[PDB]
Amino acid sequence: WEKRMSRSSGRVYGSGKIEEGKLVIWINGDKGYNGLAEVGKKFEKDTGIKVTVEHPDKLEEKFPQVAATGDGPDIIFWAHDRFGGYAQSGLLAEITPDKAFQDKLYPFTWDAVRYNGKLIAYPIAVEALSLIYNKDLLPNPPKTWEEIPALDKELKAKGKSALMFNLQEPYFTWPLIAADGGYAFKYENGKYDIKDVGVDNAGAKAGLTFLVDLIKNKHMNADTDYSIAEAAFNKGETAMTINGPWAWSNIDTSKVNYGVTVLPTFKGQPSKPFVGVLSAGINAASPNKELAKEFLENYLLTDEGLEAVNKDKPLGAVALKSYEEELAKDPRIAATMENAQKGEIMPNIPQMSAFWYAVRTAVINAASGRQTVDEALKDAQT
Ligand SMILES: OC[C@H]1O[C@H](O[C@H]2[C@H](O)[C@@H](O)[C@@H](O)O[C@@H]2CO)[C@H](O)[C@@H](O)[C@@H]1O
């Protein structure tokens, strides 16, 4: 009864699900996938190996599902935080760059893709949220979160608003939650403590309460998502937004005269955005691991490869030492680094998936009023 009702009963996955002799790459739709496809086409021109870049919706949830059956892309791009879960499930190949190649990338970026002593992805770029502001509406961005309500009252009189950003993904609210003490998992003595979650302490509660108060006082709307905030800022309807380097391209196209700067402080403390390392993992069921290695090491992670992607959508602070130096001049990147400094590198442990889902629910429910801050964060905690 037990076996025969389960899909696992005498189950052997089919062969040839992932096509040998080509590369399929998944990357998020807010990244420079058209630029990545340019690198892929160069690879095809040189080597005859076709590269297909796709940007599926919710790829970070689709990948573990399809890869578990030996299907999916040869290469998956995502922030490093999801990869430990993939690795634990046996979905990622350990990557084997030689010492010469490892020397080309910053050591801390290799650390972000290390799991149980193994490298499980290639690091590409360091991402951190910054405060983005309309210099025409706001020549001087606020130093503190606390002064934003007063700013909104000013701009509401002019038919504008102070601030809009994605409230549907907890990634964007985390800088405020972590500012005065909130944390995900406590890193102590070489390991994250999965029983030590800091989403319901005094600091986290204070931060989320300030967010909820902004909404209660009609300075923000609870259902604002990525597209709503991006559209509003790039139309010049709101003075500020919170976003990463990938967003700069659309603002460059917009008519907005904008700047990128340090996130405001909360209770005198710097906002602490979670830092992500955009990373490329190789599917453990791929028959093309040698092709993937060649593409990633000798085509993408070069000055020419990163330039192609960066020209589509800015990567931020790239992990490649040689190319990072060329872009260090950019004040937007400098601001990105400053915020990344003040923040924390995301854990990559398998528990991150559940953590993000819990905090997503908590932030959405607190913001919309489905739950109080105390109720919401209590649930998020273990
Ligand atoms: O909001 C939870 C979400 O946060 C992070 O995702 C970021 C990603 O790192 C960025 O590159 C960009 O695409 O925005 C995303 C948020 O919408 C985590 O990496 C992710 O695992 C988590 O679910």
Residue of the CA atom closest to atom 2 of ligand 1: 171
Contacts (Cβ under 8 Å, ≥6 apart) of 285: 17, 18, 67, 70, 71, 72, 91
What sign does the CA torsion over 197, 200, 203, 208 have?
positive
Three-state DSSP string of the chain: CHHHHCCCCCCCCCCCCCCCCEEEEECCCCCCHHHHHHHHHHHHHHHCCEEEEECCCCHHHHHHHHHCCCCCCCEEEEEHHHHHHHHHCCCECCCCCCHHHHCCECHHHHHHCEECCEECCEEEEEECCEEEEECCCCCCCCCEHHHHHHHHHHHHHCCCEEECCCCCCHHHCHHHHHHCCCEEEEEECCEEEEEEEECCCHHHHHHHHHHHHHHHCCCCCCCCCHHHHHHHHHCCCEEEEEECHHHHHHHHHCCCCEEEECCCEECCEECCCEEEEEEEEEECCCCCHHHHHHHHHHHHCCHHHHHHHHHHCCCCEECEHHHHHHHCCCHHHHHHHHHHHHCEECCCCCCHHHHHHHHHHHHHHHHHCCCCHHHHHHHHCC
Q: Is the CB of 52 under 6 A from ligand 1?
A: no
* Residue 266 beta carbon below 6 angstroms from any ligand 1 atom: no
Rounded to 10 degrees, what is the CA torsion of 340, 303, 82, 40? 150
Name the token pair of 252: 């460059």
Q: Which of 171, 176, 177, 348 to mutate to test the pocket of ligand 1 (most atoms within 8 A of CB)?
A: 171
Distance 307 CA to ligand 1 centre (A): 23
Q: Who contacts 295 (Cβ-Cβ below 8 Å, separation ≥6)?
A: 23, 39, 40, 43, 49, 51, 75
Instruction: Give which of 91, 89, 99, 94 is closest to 114, Cα–Cα.
Output: 94
Ligand 1 atom at minimal distance to the Cα of residue 352: 21
Structure tokens at 219: 């300075």
- Please give the distance of CA 199 from its chain centroid, rounded to a whole number: 19
Residue of 215, 216, 241, 239 whose CA lies nearest to 228? 241
Which residue, 173, 184, 182, is CA-closest to 211?
173
Strand partners, 22: 50
CA pair distance 54, 26, nearest whole angstrom: 5
Query: Is residue 380 within 8 Å of residue 362, measured between CB atoms?
Result: yes
d(CA 353, CA 367): 21
With CA atoms as reference, report the closest residue to 310 among 278, 343, 276: 278
The bridge status of strand 265-266 relative to strand 238-243 is unpaired
Distance CA 299, CA 287 (A): 19
For residue 369, count other CB atoms closer than 10 A to its CB. 11
By the 8 A CB rule, do 167 and 367 touch?
A: yes
- Give the span between the Cα atoms of 336 and 318, in whole angstroms: 11
- Rounded Cα distance between 321 and 314, Å, is 16
- Report resolution (Å) to 1 decimal: 1.9
- Could you tell me if 125 and 316 are in contact, meaning their C-beta atoms sit under 8 angstroms apart? yes
Phi, psi of 364 (to 5 degrees): -60, -45
Q: Say how far apart CA 365 and CA 349 lie, in whole Å.
A: 25
- Torsion sign, CA atoms 20, 24, 25, 26: negative
What single letter denotes the amino acid at residue 99?
K
Taken in order 203, 207, 212, 214, is the CA torsion positive or negative? positive
Residues 262, 176: Cα–Cα separation, whole Å: 13
Is the CB of 356 inside a 6 Å radius of any atom of ligand 1? yes
79 CB within 6 A, ligand 1:
yes
**Residue 249's CB: how many other CB atoms inside 10 A?**
16
Radius of gyration for the alpha carbons in the chain, expressed in angstroms and rounded: 21
250 and 230 Cβ atoms separated by less than 8 Å: yes
- Tally Cβ neighbours within 10 Å of residue 196: 13
CATH fold for the domain made of 130-274+349-380: D-Maltodextrin-Binding Protein; domain 2 (3.40.190)
Cβ distance 352 to 287 under 8 Å? no
Both tokens assigned to 192: 């994250």
268 φ, ψ (degrees, to nearest 5): 80, -5
Cβ of 273 less than 6 Å from ligand 1: no
Alpha-carbon torsion (284, 287, 290, 296), positive or negative: negative
Question: Rounded distance, CA 5 to CA 3, Å?
Answer: 6
- Measured CA to CA, the distance from residue 18 to residue 48 in angstroms comes to 18
- Burial of 159: CB neighbours in 10 Å, binned 0-12, 13-18, 19+: exposed
As to burial, measured by CB atoms within 10 angstroms (0-12 exposed, 13-18 middle, 19+ buried), residue 98 is exposed
Question: 246 with 30: CB under 8 angstroms?
Answer: yes
Report CA(157)–ligand 1 centroid distance (Å): 34
For residue 96, count other CB atoms closer than 10 A to its CB.
10
Q: Say which experimental method was used.
A: X-ray
**Which residues are CB-contacts of 248 (< 8 A; sequence separation ≥ 6)?**
260, 313, 314, 332
